[PDB]
Amino acid sequence: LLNPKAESLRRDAALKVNVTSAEGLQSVLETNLGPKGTLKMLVDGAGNIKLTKDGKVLLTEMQIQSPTAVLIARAAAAQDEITGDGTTTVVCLVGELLRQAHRFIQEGVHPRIITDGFEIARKESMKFLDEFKISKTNLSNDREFLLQVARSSLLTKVDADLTEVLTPIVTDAVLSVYDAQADNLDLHMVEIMQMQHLSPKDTTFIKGLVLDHGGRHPDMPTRVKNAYVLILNVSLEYEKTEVNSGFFYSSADQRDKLAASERKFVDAKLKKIIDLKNEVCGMDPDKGFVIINQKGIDPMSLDVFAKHNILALRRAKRRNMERLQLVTGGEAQNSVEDLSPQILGFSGLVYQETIGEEKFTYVTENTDPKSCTILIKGSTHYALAQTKDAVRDGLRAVANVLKDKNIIPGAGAFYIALSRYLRSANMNKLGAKGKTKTGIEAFAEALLVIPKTLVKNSGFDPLDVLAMVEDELDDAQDSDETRYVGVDLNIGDSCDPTIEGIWDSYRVLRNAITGATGIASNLLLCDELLRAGR
Template sequence: MSLRVLNPNAEVLNKSAALNMNINAAKGLQDVLKSNLGPKGTIKMLVGGAGDIKLTKDGNTLLKEMQIQNPTAIMIARTAVAQDDISGDGTTSTVIFIGELMKQAERCIDEGMHPRVVVDGFEIAKKATLEFLEKFKTPVVMGDGPDREMLKMVARTTLRTKLYESLADQLTDIVVNAVLCVNKPEEGIDLFMVEIMHMRHKFDVDTRLVDGLVLDHGSRHPDMKRRAENCHILTCNVSLEYEKSEINAGFFYSNAEQREAMVVAERRSVDERVRKIIALKNKVCEGTEDNFVLINQKGIDPPSLDLLARAGIVALRRAKRRNMERLVLACGGEAVNSVDDLTPDCLGWAGLVYEHVLGEEKYTFVENVKHPNSCTILIKGPNDHTIAQIKDAVRDGLRAVKNTIEDEAVVRGAGAFEVAARQHLVNDVKKTVKGRAQLGVQAFADALLIVPKTLAENSGLDTQDVIISLTGEHDNGNVVGLNQHTGDPIDPHMEGIFDNYAVKRQIINSAPVIASQLLLVDEVIRAGRDEVCFLISSLLNGHEKILFEIVALRRAKRRNMERLVLACGGEAVNSVDDLTPDCLGWAGLVYEHVLGEEKYTFVENVKHPNSCTILIKGPNDHTIAQIKDAVRDGLRAVKNTIEDEAVVRGAGAFEVAARQHLVNDVKKTVKGRAQLGVQAFADALLIVPKTLAENSGLDTQDVIISLTGEHDNGNVVGLNQHTGDPIDPHMEGIFDNYAVKRQIINSAPVIASQLLLVDEVIRAGRNMRKPT
């Protein structure tokens, strides 16, 4: 009702309606995705507005392409998609876990529990579950290299949830070998160096790993070889055609002879570049059966192709930019931007280069390289639906293997962790929790069972029998999961069923946060400006160029220029005419961090920093936005404390003390009916401790009586929001800003007084429609 006064056009859902909307949205999204979970999960058909069809059981794909309109469901979907972006899997598990947390919380709230109490129980259970996960995980000993058998088991577990069993087993070796190919222990794993190509050709079982690169184009000259062995590879970004100038320039001639002379000069320039490449070919191939292959990012015109073909060089033009780095990593050598200083050291090597024609498409295979640090997974299938399914599965498999190598740990799967964590919460953790928060811990524990329950349901098994069997085995000291074929308990370790540690940790971290936020929503307001998307701002974003051992970053944001000088020292210069060492700052470490397609440059270990960066991390935009708001408030609070040189005891202590002072001391000095105004002001101060108590699920009357009684006994006390008991804020370290309290006491009564003295509200003005 109050918001209707502020904005008559606003759509408002009150506390119970908002809670019901959030719970129903979470359960609805859960019902859509839960049938996809596990190897026995079903497939969804997505039909687009233009009639295009996609078959998938990948939760990430479904959430990205489904048209979700409910705001709560959108929030959950974004969280789940962020889960996939961070850890590469666990999208469906995140959605069904959030839905089950909301469902279990609904039962508690229907019995009269305050949502805050449920949320407190969730927080205790989340912390305990994460600690249990650290003990439950299975370490993976890397030693001299990754444990290939363990990696294969992890990849197989992931792939079998996306594809049928025999195909998943075949792709397991492909995925593991691809990750090990690009694994550099000193630099980490860059999955972008694994090229995923697809050909609508033959069958899905013909998918294979190419120890090199597959380019989606062929040579452009009929006389060039279609198959070459023992090839020297020159990777370059050099224009072998006449190009217009990058600046606006004009060439003028007065007769035809001058024009012909200019054309000849232009041709001569391009031909000289080609002849330098031919000279290098002759140098390295003379007296051998070796071949020479040129792969150029820029264009090659027909005359240049003719020269190269006559020299026996296979030339490919317009290679994609993303493949240039991959070519060097796969074949060796260097990518050159000029032909002026070509040497044999610039060349890579491939045992076989051949062209494959499929319909009107041409593909060039670069294979049998010596020490590949880049490779290609060539996906084949009879139709686009099959190829899309395999591509989604392969990407998840690559991330699963990468996570295992980086985590050096795995978690036993088939629902084993969820059953073990649930029994730990019920048998051990719940006993240590006091009060009604126990019910929140129980609700969290029961929600964990949604994973084995869903696995059983998708396999056509009786969920109750399965849960009784699994929990019984666990109580007997056995760590077991579910055999989806028979319904019997199995040892996941013996069966080779493992999940990613990073995925499980991310699910346990993010799902309860979103569920708690949704449970604490007391109003849904559909009005106001468009939603603002909060993103992490990069410190310095740019492309790094290495030249003569100088690391160069361009297009630095203007706001960071002053910060850089304050952090590193030196001066920001606008001219290079008078450069001196005094202009330079200093940093002990500068490094680049790649996150997906984004790059961040860190400038650290400066000597005397007068500027710094708070790097906020989180699984989704909602969490990041919350942390960002909290950090800004925290910075202002510390700044105010330094400037005020004073603080005020918090937890409602000041408001209770001020109220008692007004009632017991000030009111007696006031004459007449103004005493009633003093009493009203004093009672209004109690709204702070009352609201703290109400938001904690406590009885407000009991709390106020207890606090005022303690104050009358000479104790300055505030509210313990966990127990409802009075506490000494000074002993507990709870303080508010003096400036904030002072501003509130100064401004709020002024506004209230002005509003009380309004005797007429007149709605009139220029834009007011004149009465007819």
């Protein structure tokens, strides 16, 4: 039953192909789970080496040939726009669930019964997640819990040593960027910078903004305290016509007369600028003056500003100008003709940072910046990329935790408890069907993949640590008290995630479970492969 010059797959060939692709992807991403996971190198033909552990980067930047694997990777990566994490969890769950489904199918279980069992187990797991979550306190002084969450999210992406530096920076940035009001959280006010000068361990937290374009003068101020911020939109530099042109002279008088045309406007603007500087902070002690001057500045005016102890910047970015307006409170002056002291803002310590290949200006220490900046440092492209990915992941995780007070203890407690609850509830209720028990057990076994992979990546044998955790879970359930039991990936024995400080996002786990169940159900329902369109 085939048309001439046609390609198709029948019988169980589709099942074999899907299972093989799922197992291959699961094996590829297995070593990236947990803080003890491995790092993969990616080269997209350009010859540049990039190291990362994020599931989205691994799936999107790696070429996949098997069409089923392509769909699995796309579905797993789609969770980034929903929760921002769990791609590797989704892939591992899909792979293990498909493996169990194939194993049961080899015994004669129809795929539809397996899908029905998966749906029932998904409902039961949603109920378990609802009954298992812990409501985080909304008190803004809970810095310890935020630090624990940041450490848990970061350890998966860093080498466990840069954590001590990065965790506090991210936690403080996320805590500060959230105003002391209901409102909402917006990470768009948190800027990330990359510098190739220093080592990654030198990263620090920046309270305000950093400006890249500045003036040059040997007498330019190096550190300015209690500075007023003036934003100007009119050029302060000599300008020429669009077509190449210039002024030619044969005598000093002609030189002066021709240079007068160029310097007239600059001098006119500088007159009022210096008048304003004298009016405010002219004689006041322990005060400074910083002028942004979004437009360009000629060296003559830079020297004039330097002789007046004025830190002059030039060619500032429009985005930086708006961020300065929102941070320093100063307004942008369209023309000096209407210059007034009310335009002046206020800022704390203003200083310049000198680098071999560039220079930076700091406008930090504002009264209410309502923004934060994180500076990333490194010596190699891959290190900078890894640091940027880790910082973004930590920012998103902390923001989500602040938005959603629901927190799920980690350390593998969630998955083991979910599997045990599923098994016990489905064995007791017996409410779905006798044959559906096959799919229920398949789902229960598949949900244990995550702790098994985490243990394997840490070098310990799952058969022992998981058995110990199961024994501790049985003991806790027999006891009348509430206790959470997990796996200590550093010691190898069991531990309580609520005491050690390991937590998992509620939304991440919920969406990962839903996506894994959906992908498994969709794939197990594929019977034949048909090629068409060419």
